[PDB]
């Protein structure tokens, strides 16, 4: 079975066709591409090795970021795993691996990596889910030159949760991409600046990861799965010295579904022994990490499994940090969006199996790095319908057709709004400058 992550549907990639994408080339400057992955192996992908990062097609260990980004752009349609913006093995993809497990390892600069994308890869679009706080004139000039030469540059705004400028995203020649969740709400971590130009799916984004390094979750009732609805395994963290470290609980639990009622700030769980405890999330991640509150309420009650659903404040699918100071959550717990949580209410009392599984080939990630490939992927797809238009014209089309979010007009949190593939295409259908 193949799943279509919410982000793919929201940006409109599923309704268009990448049949002509062979006329476009997108270069991914990131941590490599796991070419051995079943959802990525047969893509029209190439790369240019660098002495400092080994093989572009071998990310290495714990360096799956680039593979996740690539999956959002081109996970192959094949009845397994997921699908990317251009899933039919048409688009040309070029890989430039600048990051190793330890960090940046490219023998040269970002400018050099971009040069490689253009000169060696023939890139039309260069996507960069990375950045730094520094800026220079030489770099600004180099990227402006590439942009004016017809290369569309797109980069992540950053996840610092402040107004700081991250580069290359903050240069005028590059599209700064912000992250939003499945309810189109601004992601708390997404940096907000006057450079932020457009938004894309960036919270709880399911995609491909280096084989065996992923993790998934599931909820089953009546022999049917809620996987396609979006079930996120709790990103559990427990104390590890002077900090916190990942301590995932991968197991399955089965029992009658029961809900811990939320009244004000108090919980009414009753006896959850031998049951799968459904509970509404109290509070939200931002200045703090409250996931542990609703989760612990269930555990303390004796729950065998736990399902936390989004509250009205942030109804979209959330993938928050489950900070477990006392390591109390020793049972499998997951997160689902509000709509799914309310649907589960009608199944109360029925046998339910909740499960978290490790050693998977896919995983849910959060980040402006996840929003970026939705934007660059769509940019490439839309551009394939009108390859004669320039990068600046395509960029303008995306901005002009984005769905306005948050407060009316362009804002620092979401830019012009949510990218819209269908609308952008219709725009260029009239002409390279729109109607």
């Amino acid at each position: 079975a193949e799943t279509t992550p919410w982000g793919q549907t929201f940006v409109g990639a599923t309704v268009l066709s990448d049949s002509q994408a062979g006329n476009r080339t997108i270069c991914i400057i990131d941590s490599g591409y796991d070419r051995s992955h079943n959802d990525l192996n047969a893509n029209n992908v190439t790369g240019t090795n660098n002495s400092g990062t080994g093989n572009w097609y071998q990310p290495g260990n714990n360096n799956a970021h680039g593979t996740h980004v690539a999956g959002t752009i081109a996970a192959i349609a094949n009845n397994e795993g997921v699908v990317g913006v251009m899933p039919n093995q048409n688009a040309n993809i070029h890989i430039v691996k600048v990051f190793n497990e330890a960090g940046w390892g490219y023998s040269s600069s970002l400018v050099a990596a971009i040069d490689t994308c253009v000169n060696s890869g023939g890139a039309n679009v260069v996507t960069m889910s990375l950045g730094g706080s520094g800026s220079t004139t030489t770099e600004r000039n180099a990227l402006n030159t590439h942009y004016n030469n017809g290369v569309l540059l797109i980069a992540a705004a950053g996840n610092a949760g402040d107004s700081s400028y991250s580069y290359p995203a903050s240069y005028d020649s590059v599209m700064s991409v912000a992250a939003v969740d499945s309810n189109l709400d601004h992601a708390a971590f997404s940096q907000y600046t006057d450079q932020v130009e457009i938004s894309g799916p960036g919270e709880a984004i399911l995609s491909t990861v280096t084989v065996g390094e992923g993790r998934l979750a599931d909820i089953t009732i009546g022999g049917q799965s809620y996987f396609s609805n979006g079930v996120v395994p709790h990103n559990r963290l427990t104390p590890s010295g002077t900090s916190y470290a990942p301590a995932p609980i991968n197991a399955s639990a089965t029992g009658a579904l029961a809900e811990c009622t939320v009244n004000g700030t108090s919980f009414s769980c009753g006896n959850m022994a031998n049951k799968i405890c459904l509970v509404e999330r109290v509070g939200n991640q931002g200045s703090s990490y409250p996931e542990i509150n609703s989760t612990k309420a269930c555990k303390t009650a004796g729950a065998k499994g736990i399902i936390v659903y989004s509250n009205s404040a942030l109804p979209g699918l959330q993938n928050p940090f489950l900070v477990d100071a006392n390591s109390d959550i020793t049972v499998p717990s997951v997160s689902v969006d509000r709509a799914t949580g309310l649907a589960l209410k009608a199944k109360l009392g029925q046998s339910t199996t909740v499960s978290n599984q490790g050693n998977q080939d896919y995983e849910y990630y959060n980040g402006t790095s996840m929003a970026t490939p939705h934007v660059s992927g769509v940019a490439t797809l839309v551009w394939s319908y009108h390859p004669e238009c320039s990068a600046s014209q395509v960029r303008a089309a995306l901005n002009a057709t984005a769905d306005d979010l948050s407060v009316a007009g362009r804002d620092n949190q979401t830019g012009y709004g949510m990218i819209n593939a269908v609308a952008a295409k219709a725009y260029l259908d009239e002409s390279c400058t729109g109607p």
Binding site: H65, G103, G131, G132, S369, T372
Partner: peptide
Amino acid sequence: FXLF
């Protein structure tokens, strides 16, 4: 210079 990180991934985002």
